[PDB]
Design a protein around this nucleic acid. Structure first.
Lengths: 205, 82, 123, 85, 79
RNA sequence: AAAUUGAAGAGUUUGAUCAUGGCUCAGAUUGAACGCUGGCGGCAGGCCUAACACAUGCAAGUCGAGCGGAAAUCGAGCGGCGGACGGGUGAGUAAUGCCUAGGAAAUUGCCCUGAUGUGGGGGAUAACCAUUGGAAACGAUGGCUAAUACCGCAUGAUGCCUACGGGCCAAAGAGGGGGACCUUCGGGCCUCUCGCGUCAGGAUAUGCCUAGGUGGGAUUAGCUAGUUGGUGAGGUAAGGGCUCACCAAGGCGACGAUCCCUAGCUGGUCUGAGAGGAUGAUCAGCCACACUGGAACUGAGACACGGUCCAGACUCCUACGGGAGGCAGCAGUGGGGAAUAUUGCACAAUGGGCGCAAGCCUGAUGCAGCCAUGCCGCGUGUGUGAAGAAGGCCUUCGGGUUGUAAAGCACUUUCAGUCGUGAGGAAGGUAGUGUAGUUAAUAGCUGCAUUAUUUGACGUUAGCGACAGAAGAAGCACCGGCUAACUCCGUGCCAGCAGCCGCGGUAAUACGGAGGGUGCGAGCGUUAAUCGGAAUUACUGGGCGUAAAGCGCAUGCAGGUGGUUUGUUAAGUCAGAUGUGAAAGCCCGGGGCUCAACCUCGGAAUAGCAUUUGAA
């Protein structure tokens, strides 16, 4: 499965922007972002520690568009891996191909990114990969098949990604429409809004 | 008798053989005396197609171990590898 | 306890008991309804609670609850029972699985339908 | 028996049983003759009987009707038991 | 020459010592070290040993239903 | 280098409190089942119950280079080998099994290595023919005949027995080719191949022994009399009360004998921070069993799943005399059950049997079918889109909400669909040719090449392309607290809910519906079940004044523990070495499948045990 339903609703619950639309219009102009979804949206108060943790976990899932079974596996790998379970989990999510074609700017959202990947638009080291969740490694070259180099959604998304801050761990030639995952991002590189700690804590609870 | 033969492991449609010394009376994939090598008939990339410890092969042949036709051909291949 | 006491007689594992002894560690059990009656709860509670005495395949006679509004169970109905105390009713340790063998889905339920055996409204 | 082979094996095994039984019976008869004489006490007749049985025991050992070890045993025992007289 | 020492604990059998061998073992659960005792019918040809003697026995062929140990050496006779 | 980075609590006793203490919940798991729902793929899994009864087909043959033959290069027959494997099941078994580590008294077909032989004879017999019994099954009687069938004789020691000194034991040929010498022209004769005997090593397999470990019950304390040991005899491949006779009175047991209940064991598996706890599907090792009970025979090996005999229960056939059979092999049927699949394809591959080989056989095995049973991956669209549409629901009647959600407008087309292309799994087989060995030999034979030719069940294969179009693809539980998510109607201690605390007797966030929301998603719930939480059997890691708990008091055997000190010993302890601790799994690094599951290489681990050397 992939969650197919209304996007901004998610952002409203999480009380933030998850970037589930391209940032051409501000999330606030497209939705009442500061109210939660539904008829009790303007009534927010005490959330439990459990709820607080839960939300944070969902924030990160919904950003990267991963369902729970997969997400829990990522946590299990992040734990197994040496060092900081919280950081490992983020670098696991950041290493996904659907995220990596978004970070490079081939897709305007992480969901367009995923369609690109699924629909066999993307090469990794010159081989066609159509698994979203494939783990792009260091020094891997994510490219676009010559077929898809003419898709105007791609050209669009490159200029959409000009409007954002650049990833300093990804290099992209948007003219040749190829990017290099130079290296895995550090914790410092990513959003500091994410409290990975809470998600680790959730998966002990 | 003692025989040197292939023991199918791997997965459906993706056979991977261990080359084993065994009593012939056993099931090919059961009780074996010694694993002396392996044979990946569908090996790609860096994965070795044939490891075979020829010294151990000779040891056992000298003790009256038979070789299966297949292992007999892989012994040739391991000698053209030497 | 001293070590030498524990060496002489080690600490004893505790015999647990099943609340659903009739199931005999099976997820469900088929039985035939011998009596389909109503009973009044233990008090604080007040109702007429639909139950059936059931003879199971393993030869146990047990009382099962019949949950949801309305049922089609006469005496001689072949029902499937699962585990589940009814707190109110002392004695009732099993539920009748609605929507399985002779027991029918609760009529015109639309939330928690799977729990009551009702198929999905043709929309 | 279900198969033809099973049916044959049964027939064969019978003929072999008959054959083995005859041979065993004889070898035993000639052993009993030694035993008799060793029990009676006659160191001569004992050695005489023992000279008849020795080949038979050794033959039946090679032909499989008994083990080598069984032949040895009987020969060894009998020899002691006569020397003892 | 893997022998085992012990103490005669019966001698009433003809040509047979029951010998009690004593092991000091850590308890699997409770951690305490604990005397445990193997009795082992050994064979005493000459009826040398007597109830109380400390003997050294060695494993051998079965000599009876219960005897597959043999007296090597008497170490220390009884009072 | 690494072989880890690991440990949460909550609810409920009271007017309130703090303790104690149960109960309950959140997690993980599964050979699951059930309810609702359901797209694809990969990889696994799939009678846990009735060791119930089984229709039908199939699961063990092969060899004409052992043999006479001839029904039609092969039926039937003799003979060899296999049928003891492979496959199934867990009934029995609580230790005669299994695990670990040793041991001595053994054997071991096929195989390897070595040494020796393989002489010369004999009598049969099935098939067949003739006659005859029987309903059949299955026989009978009389002739005939072969052999690598069988038997004697000869021969044999590095064999066996023997105090010597001696004595004793076996065997089989068949096939290809051929120089010369022979030829009664059959053949001898040579060479090679495949066989045959004996012996010795090896290898493999198996038997036997010991110690430790391996459930529960003491409201089971005595148990044993071939019993325990001895002697002798027998017996066995082999030690041994294994058996018998005889002598003695032993043996076992509170470190639990005996008895009773339960139970296949292990590698592992699940859970757990760990220590533990639980468990023993799939995979692999071991054991046991084959309708029930008994028995042996044949054989290297069986006390023999698809062998024999006997007894029994059952089912069947019968011409009433008599016969037949054993799915816990694979399919499958009935039955039982909450519940578990096709009477499939193929020997192409890996093996196994037989065969010189070619091959033949192989329900092993490879594959295919069926099932959301599990794990993993993917999809069911992407972006834009405010009049914030309509409709639904709520409303302080202002509006809010569903909701950028929809529509609309641009896109994309994985996967399904269709049409094409198209790996890999294949090693081999046959026939030439050459070569190099063998050899008298440009022969034969065997190898190596090399030429030609043939071998794929899966299969319409994976993988790739090309089309056309968003086109064909979303549920399920929950929303009183625990516990993420609230309102409105209906109901009025009813109907109903409920894991726990409880909820419902008129404004019910607890019932039922709706709107909205939350969680999860081709699943989601429920039930059952294990561990966790539970430090709630506490070794790690608890308690006993009053919460449950100090025997009424003492004496005391076994046991447990024990002052100071020298020396010694090295049992405990510690350190190291060696052997072992199967493989798989787990863990760490890699490697290969587009990723993942999965497969796979190396390591670590196997905390132990044995032997050994040190420390003291």
């Amino acid at each position: 499965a992939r969650y197919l339903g209304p996007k901004l609703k998610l952002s409203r619950r999480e009380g933030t922007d998850l970037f589930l639309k391209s940032g051409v219009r501000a999330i606030d102009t497209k939705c009442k972002i500061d109210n939660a979804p539904g008829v009790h949206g303007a009534r927010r108060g005490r959330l439990s520690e459990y709820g607080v943790q839960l939300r944070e976990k969902q924030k990160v899932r919904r950003m990267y568009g991963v369902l729970e079974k997969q997400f829990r596996n990522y946590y299990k790998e992040a734990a197994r891996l040496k060092g900081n379970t919280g950081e490992n989990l983020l670098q696991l999510l950041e290493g996904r191909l659907d995220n990596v074609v978004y970070r490079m700017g081939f897709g305007a959202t992480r969901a367009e990114a995923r369609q690109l990947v699924s629909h066999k638009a993307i090469l990794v080291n010159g081989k066609v990969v159509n698994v979203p969740s494939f783990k792009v490694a260091a020094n891997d070259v994510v490219s676009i098949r010559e077929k898809a180099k003419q898709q105007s959604r791609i050209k669009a998304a490159l200029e959409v990604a000009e409007q954002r801050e650049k990833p300093t761990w990804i290099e992209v030639d948007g003219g040749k429409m190829e990017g290099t995952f130079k290296r895995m991002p550090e914790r410092s590189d990513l959003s500091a809004d994410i409290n990975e700690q809470l998600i680790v804590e959730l998966y002990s609870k | 008798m003692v025989t040197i033969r292939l023991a199918r492991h791997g997965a459906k449609k993706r056979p991977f053989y261990q080359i084993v010394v065994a009593d012939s009376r056993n099931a090919a994939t059961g009780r074996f005396i010694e694993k002396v090598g392996f044979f990946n008939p569908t090996a790609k990339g860096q994965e070795e197609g044939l490891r075979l410890d020829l010294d151990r092969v000779n040891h056992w042949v000298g003790q009256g171990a038979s070789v299966s036709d297949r292992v007999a051909k892989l012994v040739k291949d391991a000698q053209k590898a030497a | 306890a001293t070590i030498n006491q524990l060496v002489r007689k080690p600490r004893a594992k505790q015999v647990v008991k099943s609340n659903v002894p009739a199931l005999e560690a099976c997820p469900q059990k088929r039985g035939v309804c011998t009596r389909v009656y109503t009973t009044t709860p233990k008090k604080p509670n007040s109702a007429l609670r639909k139950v059936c005495r059931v003879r199971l395949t393993n030869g146990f006679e047990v009382t099962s609850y019949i949950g949801g509004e309305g049922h089609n169970l006469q005496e001689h109905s072949v029902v499937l029972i699962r585990g589940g105390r009814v707190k109110d009713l002392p004695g009732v340790r099993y539920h009748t699985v609605r929507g399985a063998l002779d027991c029918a889905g609760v009529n015109d339920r639309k939330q928690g339908r799977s729990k009551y055996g009702v198929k999905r409204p043709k929309s | 028996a279900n198969s033809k082979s099973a049916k044959k094996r049964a027939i064969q095994a019978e003929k072999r049983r008959q054959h083995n039984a005859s041979r065993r019976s004889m070898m035993r008869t000639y052993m009993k003759k030694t035993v008799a004489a060793i029990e009676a006490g006659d160191k001569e007749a004992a050695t005489a009987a023992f000279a008849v049985v020795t080949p038979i025991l050794d033959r039946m050992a090679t032909k499989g009707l008994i083990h080598k070890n069984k032949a040895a045993r009987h020969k060894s025992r009998f020899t002691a038991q006569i020397k003892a007289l | 020459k893997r022998t085992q020492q012990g103490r005669v604990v019966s001698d009433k059998m003809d040509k047979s010592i029951t010998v009690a061998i004593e092991r000091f073992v850590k308890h699997p659960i409770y951690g305490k070290y604990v005397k445990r005792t193997t009795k082992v019918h050994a064979h005493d040809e000459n009826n040398e040993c007597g109830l109380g003697d400390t003997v050294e026995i060695a494993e051998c062929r079965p000599l009876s239903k219960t005897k597959s140990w043999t007296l090597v050496k008497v170490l220390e006779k009884a009072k």
